[PDB]
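question for whoever is on the cluster today: can someone run the full assembly for these? six chains, 898 residues total. i dont have access anymore since they changed the login thing
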Amino acid sequence: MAAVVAKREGPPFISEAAVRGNAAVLDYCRTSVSALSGATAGILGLTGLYGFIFYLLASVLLSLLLILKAGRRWNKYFKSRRPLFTGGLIGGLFTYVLFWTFLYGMVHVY
Amino acid sequence: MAPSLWKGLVGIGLFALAHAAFSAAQHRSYMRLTEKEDESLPIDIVLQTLLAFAVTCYGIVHIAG
Amino acid sequence: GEVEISALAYVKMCLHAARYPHAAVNGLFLAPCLTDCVPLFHSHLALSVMLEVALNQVDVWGAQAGLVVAGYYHANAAVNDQSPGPLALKIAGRIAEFFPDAVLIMLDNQKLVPQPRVPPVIVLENQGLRWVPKDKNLVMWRDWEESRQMVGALLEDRAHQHLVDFDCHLDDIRQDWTNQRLN
Amino acid sequence: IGDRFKIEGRAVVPGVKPQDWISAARVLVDGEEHVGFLKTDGSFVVHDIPSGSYVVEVVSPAYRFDPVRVDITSKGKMRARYMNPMVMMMVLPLLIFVLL
Amino acid sequence: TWEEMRDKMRKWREENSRNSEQIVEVGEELINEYASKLGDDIWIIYEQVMIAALDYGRDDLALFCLQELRRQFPGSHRVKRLTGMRFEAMERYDDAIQLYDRILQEDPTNTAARKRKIAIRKAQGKNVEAIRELNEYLEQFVGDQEAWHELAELYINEHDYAKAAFCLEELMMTNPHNHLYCQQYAEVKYTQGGLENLELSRKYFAQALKLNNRNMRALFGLYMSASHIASNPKASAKTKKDNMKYASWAASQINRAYQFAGR
Amino acid sequence: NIRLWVVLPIVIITFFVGMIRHYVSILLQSQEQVSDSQVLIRSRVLRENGKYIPKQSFLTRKYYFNNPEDGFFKKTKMMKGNVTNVLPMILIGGWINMTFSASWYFLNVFGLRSIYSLILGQDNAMPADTNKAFKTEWEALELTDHQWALDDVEEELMAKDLHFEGMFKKELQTSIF
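^ ran it for u. tokens below:
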């Protein structure tokens, strides 16, 4: 209407909205992570110390999937590069083990 | 991955979970019920576990959105 | 002077004027000998900048045509808008040097709510630079039958935008300055 | 005879089950191995126990029966003698304050 | 549903356009066709293509589904808004006044009603009165000075240039990234032209020209900004020649433009 | 043995909290001041933008501010729902108590974040302004007449980059062609 013919063939600079968007994307990602974490737990049932090890490996695969969404845009379409991969999953780790908790279904966790 | 395929493979992950559930049933059965405690991780079961992990991987991948 | 130009240009001008939702636009008219015209732009639509580049495009495209500068065949707003505005006033005033025999054109625009097809071609000769309405015989729509026919056609055909402009070239950098093809 | 003496005196009977007391009768010292009653009613009466003393008792699966000590005299002198929600709620108010 | 078309219209509508005659015609057609395959969405969905008749006026089915809603709408001001729209279609100017002003006496929110109110007061071209109205109303309004934008559009159409470029600025501020709107206010001061004009105008103009590396409008825009606004022949050849080298820089990108035009 | 027959109560409580969230959301769901507040927001935003605003524009706005701020200050011269949301904890507590490891309360405290997140797939959950306006506005107008000088300065700094960068702009347009 007003500036009807504006027709922006492109939006403005990267916006904190979409930043938070991709961020929560990573959040639900870590969610799925903790999910697969309890999953592998059940797959082994072990509360064994190797548990947190497989959890590490999981988060590894997580950053690897982040890489799989590469598009060469490491910083470009995804503002930062390193801290993104540094996804601070500590509390969800708790969750993940909590996930592992139900993995106890066989015999495991008491 | 494809989003319809995403929901499908997520369901496939849950299905592998249930397969493993029946498998662990049989395993603990052999162990205690059958009193044959040699019920180590069935190679089939371990392979299914790894496959389900990978299914979850590609699932979340497509689940990026 | 007697001249029969392809008002298909002004036809599409008014077509967009409606299409630009019933919206008034900028429109020109000139040639070495009057054959076509040019809807200038979209609404209140030639800036010091844009009007300047208009004159630029004029010198060039008419140099690209060996043309002769005449003036504006533009589009007002009111349901039967025929009088000019200080904008169109200065338009005709400056164009008085462009050509010898200043005239003016008129048409109704009741399509604010409506979607019309009436042949509105009217002439008001700018005698002494004042748009004195010429004898209503001169205010005529030649082949008003075929005129309104092609009008309703382009309406349904939506070809109101089938033409481009330097303002389209403006409203879109890469766009054509006329869409010089049959559309 | 003190050296072996009867079992009676200022007796009493809490639960003596009219026509039913001696049914499953228990009364003695463990000990002074003998039963004491009087079937005509069951009224505890025994004999033949040494002097000094002993506590005795009467019992059966009936819901009123008891012990009593008896002091026996060489003189034969009859002697004797006798919330989950609460924990949860405490937890809840603190959590509400923390969320606030 | 032809969910392809479903999302397509969700967008088209969402695109907030008005080229709705034939497009929205096909749309409302498909709506009438497969509202079954549509479901809950139609609750307002077809409305989009529907509101085209608002302009267009295939008012039979329009008013028909409209009353379908007016019932489904369990009697709220929004159906009343559609009602003001139809009274417009019905040309029921004073009756639209009745309806709208009444809703006002009931609900004060949708000045879109009052929008149409001033737009009718001046629809035939009574711009001045309804314009002062729109002034006091934007004074009553608080938000999308996009409204105030078009207001000032009318204003500087009456050559109210001062407050016009003022609001142009204010808007672009509210639109911190007002790239094309930078181009706009630029052109506003162009229409003004002048020394302090030149300064602020070419400033925003090139700021976006850079910012919109595709705005060839803005190219010639900031260009003529410097080249004319203060640059009237009394131009100081120190700064004039400086900006003239920059004009040669423009002209270099412009030979390149002619080249990419050959491309 | 009885494992699952008590276990499933976990998921029971899970979807139960889900209902709590969504339902209770519906339940909580179950003008002059506004315009003034909008104006106040605009004024704050205006201060926030300042830097973007050009100095000539800033100065004009500053004149508008000086006339107001003073003018603006002159113009603008129970626990029910909390206890409601809380008591359900106690109700479920007594319930599970009757429904009696402690994994009940454990998973209870546990699941919330993850579940609720995935559950919705989302979170599933006058005078003082006047004085502040005068004070802040007058300080802010000085701060942003400096920002205003910076806004205008942007033009001059931009100028050289734009000048040389015009060929690069032609390149950028051709690339976006």
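summary bc i know u wont read the tokens: The interface with chain F takes residues 27-28, 31, 34, 91-92, 95, 98, 101, 110 of chain A (CB under 8 Å). DSSP finds four helices and no strands in chain A.
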